[PDB]
Ligand binder design. Structure first.
Ligand code: F43
Ligand code: F43
Ligand SMILES: C[C@@H](OP(=O)(O)O)[C@H](NC(=O)CCCCCCS)C(=O)O
Ligand SMILES: C[C@@H](OP(=O)(O)O)[C@H](NC(=O)CCCCCCS)C(=O)O
Ligand SMILES: O=S(=O)(O)CCS
Ligand code: NA
Ligand SMILES: [Zn+2]
Lengths: 247, 548, 442, 442
């Protein structure tokens, strides 16, 4: 697959995020427990709540599609469908809303992804959500200053940065320590205080942000200058227009 | 010099508009705001009075961790907090809707033919004047025939009346000028010539029923109320039997055969009668706005006054209350009529078109769409990138998408002189915007924008329609903010550039060229500002019949 | 075989056509001519090619007084009507040998379209007729003149109006005798929402044909509504026969006997005599110089009273050659016959009730209009179950020109197109013929 | 045939049934099984006799929480169901040997009713089914227990609810898959106003059969709406064939290839490969490390893309065994495939648009709900012309129990009754067999 047109670093980064054969750069290590803490759906050590019986304990209808499509582990167990949601600053966050949703449905099975301007969300079976969330938090999907894990009160993608280069958070879930240069998550994604903070590492520097970002900007790489990307979008508009009139 | 939005941005923030960083969290939350402080104090009093908790700043999340901005109402020097532009808090906005809801246009042409053909009586400019004096007594709710009738209090219904207009100058001259919408007085010469030619020797009534009735009841009341008092006044003035067979002819003419509703009725899922916002087509909304007849040398001003009219009505009142409610959609709409932002983008596009093609001189095709819409889209989006204050101001993607696409669509229509290629430009703008910033609007913002390109030039049953004829009930458009008012602007755009007197209906254009309306439709944004300052005096108040 | 009743069927000159016909041979459920008339009305559309051309030339589309300056298109539509209609038929038809009909009228200014019945066999309702016809002609016009992608939406507006912004085809230049399904007062009402003026237009003001078509439509609706199911079926069938089909020549003979000098009152006297003569009613009780009548067959009494009602309308409104008094006839025929007999009037008071509101809403300020704009789906005239509206059709057929909102004013397009169809124009002839055909099939 | 296309027909186990069948053998206008399904859905009513009995015993009639104290009637309806059903059938039927069906289910607690087709041959629409059924059972219940004139109106309320004060049968104890004609978003929309949960209930959660029934209803509506006329007819037929009927086993094979480990992205890659393999698309232009694809046959490209869309839904929502993500699949399958190819997505962007609003209105405060409560007549999901709703039916069929408003909660009565009908339950079987039968009449 070729994924996306364009000859900019932005375009290549968009292709890379979508391409399952591209190994996302892991930037930080987060423990299993801490992912569960950030998600806030259950306590560490608490059993997965269920929304229906295990598939094995039900009489599924005779169905060739059911026979051919392998359920994810959480579906087999009958897990709740839970979520993780991110906000990405328009000041050069590595991942951006549509890039996330496009990437998620290329990379992950059984995914419900939603794109908005100030937030992006994925909902899947809880135990599989935890495995996906680890990758979303550990890799270049996430920068602890320009990205935020936010289940509500998401305001910030379009706001100016604070003195530390941190994105605005109404609930200040992620705290930059001026003495140490590291960011800690002090609340879970819905905004409830954590027992013990989770280290999210150092913010990426300006040079690395520019290398990794998927947003076009006049002070980065401008979309209008990626003429091959623009051409395809204009081609789509024209072919859709003609198709609606006659086929 | 500056971009037109610079003054507004300077008034909002301590920083220069170009600065990328700021300070949060230490502003005092809601305490930074005069308006939120008024609300907190009011909430305490309300709760105590009624014995039920109400407004409480400690419920949910704490507002005001960032600067709570003032907004400049575009083309004014009035700066207000956003709460003052909520329709519930703004009497000017409420009265604008009431003035449309309580209006119907009813011909006298069928009626006069019944009088002369069925009754065998004469109609003259003298009988018409007598009829008009009669109906202006009757229409607010007063009696003309029966004994022992009880009537509405004249002061409660002071805003209700009936006027007429006709394309025939001599006949208009013969009718008492108190009852006449003077087309030659209200419109510039060339526009007046066009409108009189459209109307011809036809004679039309503009009926406005009382605001207090419109508020107690609904929009579907208007044409019925109108018809009842036209009926009584026809009986009285022309000496029918008070209730003979011919009386039914007048009823059918006034209710069906020669009536123009402001809005048509809606399907069951959004069930509403006539004269509700969803039934008002974009062409009508453009013609209700009277900017065309006072700002005709500035097509951008005309188009953007229509955008303001529609953004407020369609997003704040219609989608934000009739179709949902609560806190609602104030800022989804204010994006289109504050801080001179859409003005800057659209003046840029106008100048681009003016320099490259000349207005209405571009080929009406896809080549022009690709050129103008792309150029204007890139300009708009570059302003958000160059000015961090602008991006923080219009913080929601939906709000930026609407503003950028509105400028792009209006500018394309400035070039082609055709609203349909203007619409195609609106959709192209959305596609480019989405790819540039890897976002667009809210979860369901671009339902219509993804269907958009294919449905612009479609001819199929529930797809194909000139933009002027589309409205809030066009299927793709029936749900979402940040489109409807902007479409009204795009409808206006080619006609403003062409110098056309109207967009879709000349009777509607003339019907609101009336100095006796409560809301001033020649200066919509000025009126919104006046309402924000709590200086607008609406009709329909019950102060006269309630305790001191 | 369900009912034992048999009727004699006549033509509109009062000649016997077929004796001893089983009642059910006239049922909408059995009679193939009624089936053909209903399926015809579902599938027939009038197209105003001249209106489309003028709308395009002037950019006057989308409703009253509406115009879009700068959008004008000058197309020679009527001049190329033959080619356009042929192209349209190719899209409308399912197969080359089906029952699709497209016929040019008025030198190409108009077109009669009958959409193939195959399309309705796999449709839920009837809207396929206007919608298939509209898009076929829109596409045919665009293809004929190679109208650009940029301008084609104007052709759509000229044909179908402001739909879908409006729920109705507001400003359209096509017409059907049926209205859109959303405007039904209730489920099953579709065949009732046909303007009285349309019926009178389609039958070219032939009084008995207008009465017949109206009764066929009204009583067929009573079956779709479920009103003619079980206990009430016979009453509805007898009503169809005697009021609308001139069964036993009862309507014709009451009119013949009272046409020269008669009144509503004299028609009543004759009908009560005839009912007594035929043994439909008998004296049940004697009061003081007053006979109270009874009956062992209320459905048959209702049928006889209904025939008298139709005759009284033809005599009263026929004498005036003015339709407005039909609301009065419908009221006082029934009011008078109850105090004359001690038996309930037509439809057990429901015709009288309908007439009270109908009178009010054709002589007042509040709504309604002239007799011609009403129909069985109108809120004013829906209440009687098939027994009132046929008389209004008869009255409007007899009107000599006293109405402002006449068939000429409201139904000109319907008249030119729908009157071309023989079974719409002369429904009585065909329903009688079909009933004779299936006579010993019942 | 109008078109040259031929397709290979497969069953729901992915086995070849018939080779080289003309495309129009699957047309709603030509296929006898589709005609049978549409006419079946028009005439079929579910009667809840237990619900009627409980309503009468408690006087709880006329809507949610409603009750009239003092009006209780203690009638053994279920105990006497056989007698009541036989009496009702006698009124519902036109003749003795006709196609009326009244069958008791659940020990007499429920009844499947199929109103004779002769009643619809002479009706404008479909409301005769609930109205004829309702009045037959009301009269049957009254006659059974000799319910007095004074109490009988309670039986009417228990059967049909608050109609006609309400426009709908509010509180009724009968149900159909169709809704009342007044609730149509537009003319021609009737077959679209069938809840997704109803389709899934009738097909017993068999994914391919659910997808098939849904596509048959959606595309048949496209004909009644006039959308599938002229220039667009072939695109709609190809969509029916490839997305809903598993033509050429394309949907099946894409699911097989991606079922074990696949994603929406891997399905796209396979579909584009297959389109290239079959000559549906070809490289038109080379940009920098990016191939721009073109096609001489947009309708066929659209059909292939639509098959992939259905497969992507089955793989994504099948893997989750949870329906909610179908709104995401419908969006991003199309968003991705456009940037993968440089060609327009399914229905030229209209599926993607429908998906955007569908996502919003299934994940927000403003309206909508879960996937199962949508339909082609819903304001949120009416925009794609047949290409979106069939995927929602497939997704709901695959749901293992994550939905509060499931078929079990919204469509229990529909499931018990309508799943009895073979052609409703296994439409893919019967439509394919019919296509093979009429293979050489096309
Ligand atoms: C709960 C939902 C989901 C839904 O159904 N509607 C909400 C909430 C709702 C509520 C919020 C009121 C409150 O706080 O109690 C109201 C006012 C509607 C109402 N019930 O009166 C609203 N949204 Ni919302 N909502 C809006 C917006 C948005 C933008 C905000 C983005 C940002 O970065 O701040 C995002 C969508 C997006 O990302 O594009 C958004 C999301 C949401 N929108 C997310 C909550 C997001 C969060 O957790 O912070 N809205 C806007 O983009 C601008 C206008 C604004 C609306 C009020 C106004 O017009 O004045 C408001 C309109
Ligand atoms: C023009 C009509 C025909 C029609 O469509 N409506 C009228 C008039 C209308 C007007 C009278 C207002 C006015 O005088 O300008 C209003 C108030 C409706 C409106 N447009 O607001 C009305 N009738 Ni009327 N109309 C009434 C009545 C009546 C009674 C009056 C009988 C008598 O002896 O006075 C009669 C009907 C009857 O004979 O039964 C009547 C007729 C009529 N009614 C005759 C005029 C009769 C006359 O020439 O005097 N109304 C009533 O019976 C009581 C209530 C009363 C209504 C006002 C209220 O409820 O306060 C009024 C209700
Ligand atoms: C009949 C109908 O009027 P139209 O014939 O449709 O104009 C109807 N009016 C009314 O029923 C008015 C009722 C109240 C005034 C009369 C009271 S007795 C309405 O406006 O929908
Ligand atoms: C979808 C439909 O809702 P339901 O699914 O029928 O509940 C519809 N709501 C709306 O369209 C609300 C629109 C305005 C709020 C969202 C603005 S983006 C309505 O209430 O008729
Ligand atoms: O967050 S949502 O896009 O669902 C609503 C925006 S107000
Ligand atoms: Na690890
Ligand atoms: Zn109100």
């Amino acid at each position: 697959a070729q994924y996306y047109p364009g000859t900019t670093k932005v375009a290549q980064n968009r292709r890379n995020f979508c391409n399952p054969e591209y190994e996302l750069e892991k930037l930080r290590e987060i423990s299993d427990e801490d992912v569960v803490k950030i998600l806030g759906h259950r306590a560490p050590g608490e059993e997965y709540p269920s929304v229906h019986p295990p598939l094995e304990e039900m009489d599924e209808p005779e169905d060739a599609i059911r026979e051919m499509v392998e359920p994810i582990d959480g579906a087999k167990a009958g897990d709740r469908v839970r979520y993780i949601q991110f906000t990405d600053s328009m000041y050069f966050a590595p991942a951006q809303p549509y890039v996330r949703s496009r990437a998620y449905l290329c990379r992950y099975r059984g995914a419900d992804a939603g794109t908005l301007s100030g937030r992006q969300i994925i909902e899947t079976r809880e135990r599989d959500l935890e495995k996906i969330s680890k990758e979303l938090l550990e890799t270049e999907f996430f920068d602890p200053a320009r990205s935020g894990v936010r289940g509500k009160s998401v305001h910030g993608h379009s706001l100016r940065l604070d003195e530390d280069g941190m994105m605005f958070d109404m609930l200040r879930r992620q705290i930059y320590n001026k003495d140490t240069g590291r960011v800690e998550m002090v609340k879970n994604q819905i905004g409830d205080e954590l027992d013990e903070p989770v280290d999210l590492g150092e913010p990426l520097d300006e040079e690395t942000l520019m290398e990794k970002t998927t947003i076009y900007r006049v002070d980065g790489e401008a979309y209008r200058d990626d003429v091959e990307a623009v051409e395809i979008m204009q081609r789509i508009h024209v072919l859709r227009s003609q198709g609606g009139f006659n086929l | 010099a500056d971009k037109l939005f610079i003054n507004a941005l300077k008034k909002k923030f301590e920083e220069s508009p170009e600065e990328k960083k700021t300070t949060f969290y230490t502003l005092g939350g809601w305490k930074q705001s005069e308006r939120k402080t008024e609300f907190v104090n009011a909430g305490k009093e309300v709760a105590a009075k009624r014995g039920i908790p109400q407004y409480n700043p400690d419920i949910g999340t704490p507002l005001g961790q960032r600067v709570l901005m003032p907004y400049q109402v575009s083309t004014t020097d009035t700066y207000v907090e956003g709460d003052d532009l909520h329709f519930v808090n703004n009497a000017a906005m409420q009265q604008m809707w009431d003035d449309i809801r309580r209006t119907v246009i009813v011909g006298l042409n069928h009626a006069h033919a019944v009088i002369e053909k069925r009754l065998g009586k004469e109609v003259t400019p003298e009988t018409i004047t007598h009829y008009l004096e009669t109906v202006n007594h009757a229409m607010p709710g007063a009696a003309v025939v029966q004994e022992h009738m009880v009537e509405t209090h004249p002061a409660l219904v002071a805003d209700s009346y009936v006027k007429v207009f006709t394309g025939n100058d001599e006949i208009a001259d013969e009718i008492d000028p108190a009852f006449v919408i003077d087309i030659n007085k209200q419109f510039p010469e060339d526009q007046a010539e066009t409108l009189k030619a459209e109307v011809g020797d036809g004679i039309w009534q503009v009926v406005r029923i009382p605001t207090i009735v419109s508020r107690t009841c609904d929009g579907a009341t208007t044409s019925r109320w109108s018809a009842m008092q036209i009926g009584m006044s026809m009986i009285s003035a022309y000496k029918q039997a008070a209730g003979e067979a011919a009386t039914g002819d007048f009823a059918y003419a006034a209710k069906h055969a020669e009536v123009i509703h402001m809005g048509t009725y809606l399907p069951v899922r959004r069930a509403r009668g006539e004269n509700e916002p969803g039934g008002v087509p974009f062409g009508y909304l453009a013609d209700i706005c009277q900017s065309s007849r006072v700002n005709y040398e500035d097509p951008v001003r005309v188009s953007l006054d229509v955008v303001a009219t529609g953004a407020m009505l369609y997003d704040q009142i219609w989608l934000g209350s009739y179709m949902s409610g609560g806190v609602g959609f104030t800022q989804y709409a204010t994006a289109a009529y504050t801080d001179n932002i859409l003005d800057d983008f659209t003046y840029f596009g106008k100048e681009y078109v003016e320099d490259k093609y000349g207005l209405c001189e571009a080929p009406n095709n896809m080549d022009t769409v690709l050129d103008v819409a792309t150029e204007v889209t890139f300009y708009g989006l570059e302003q958000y990138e160059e000015y961090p204050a602008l991006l923080e101001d219009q913080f929601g993607g939906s709000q930026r998408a609407a503003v950028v696409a509105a400028a792009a669509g209006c500018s394309t229509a400035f070039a082609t002189g055709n609203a349909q290629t203007g619409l195609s430009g609106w959709y192209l703008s959305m596609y480019l915007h989405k790819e540039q910033h890897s976002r667009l609007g809210f979860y369901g913002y671009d339902l219509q924008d993804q269907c958009g390109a294919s449905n612009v030039f479609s001819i199929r049953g529930d797809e194909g329609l000139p933009l002027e004829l589309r409205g809030p009930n066009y299927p793709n458009y029936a749900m979402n903010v940040g489109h409807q008012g902007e479409y009204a602007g795009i409808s206006q755009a080619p006609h403003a550039a062409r110098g056309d007197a109207f967009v879709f209906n000349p009777l509607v254009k003339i019907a609101f060229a009336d100095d006796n309306l409560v809301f001033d439709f020649t200066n919509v944004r000025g009126e919104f500002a006046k309402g924000a300052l709590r200086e607008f005096e609406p009709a329909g108040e019950r102060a006269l019949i309630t305790p001191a | 075989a369900k009912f034992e009743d048999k009727v004699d069927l006549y033509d509109d000159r009062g000649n016997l056509v077929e004796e001893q016909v089983p009642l059910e041979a006239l049922s909408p459920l059995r009679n193939p001519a009624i089936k053909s008339i209903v399926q015809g009305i579902k599938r027939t559309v009038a197209v105003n090619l001249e209106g489309i051309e003028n709308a395009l030339k002037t950019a006057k589309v989308g409703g009253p007084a509406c115009k879009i300056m700068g959008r004008e298109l000058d197309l020679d539509i009527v001049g190329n009507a033959e080619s356009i209609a042929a192209a349209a038929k190719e899209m409308i038809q399912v197969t080359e040998d089906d029952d699709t009909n497209v016929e040019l009228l008025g030198g190409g200014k108009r077109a009669l379209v009958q959409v193939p019945s195959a399309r309705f066999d796999v449709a839920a309702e009837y809207s396929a007729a206007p919608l298939v016809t509209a898009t076929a002609f829109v596409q045919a016009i665009i293809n004929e003149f190679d109208v650009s992608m940029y301008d084609a939406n104007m052709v759509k507006a000229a044909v179908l109006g402001r739909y879908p912004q409006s729920v109705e085809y507001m400003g359209a230049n096509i017409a059907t005798m049926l209205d859109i399904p959303q405007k039904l007062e209730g489920p099953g009402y579709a065949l009732r929402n046909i303007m009285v003026n349309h019926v009178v237009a389609a039958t070219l003001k032939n009084t008995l044909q207008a009465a017949a078509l109206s009764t066929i439509l009204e009583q067929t609706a009573m079956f779709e509504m479920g009103d003619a199911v079980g206990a009430f079926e016979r009453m509805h069938l007898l009503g169809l026969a005697y009021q609308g089909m001139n069964a036993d020549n009862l309507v014709f003979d009451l009119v013949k006997a009272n046409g020269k000098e008669g009144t509503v009152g004299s028609v009543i006297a004759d009908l009560v005599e005839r009912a007594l003569e035929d043994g439909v009613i008998k004296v049940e009780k004697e009061l003081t110089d007053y006979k109270v009548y009874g009956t062992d067959d209320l459905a048959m009494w209702n049928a006889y009273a209904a025939a008298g009602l139709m005759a009284a309308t033809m005599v009263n409104q026929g004498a005036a050659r003015a339709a407005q008094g039909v609301s009065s006839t419908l009221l006082y025929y029934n009011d008078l016959i109850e105090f004359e007999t001690g038996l309930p009037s037509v439809d057990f008071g429901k015709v009288e009730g309908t007439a009270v509101g109908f009178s009010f809403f054709s002589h007042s300020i509040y709504g309604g209009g002239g007799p011609g704009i009403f129909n069985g789906n109108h809120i004013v005239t829906r209440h009687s179950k098939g027994f009132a509206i046929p008389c209004v059709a008869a009255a409007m057929a007899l009107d000599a020109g006293t109405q402002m909102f006449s068939p000429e004013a409201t139904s000109g397009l319907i008249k030119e197109v729908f009157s071309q169809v023989d079974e719409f124009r002369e429904p009585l002839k065909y329903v009688v013929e079909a009933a004779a055909e299936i006579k010993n099939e019942i």
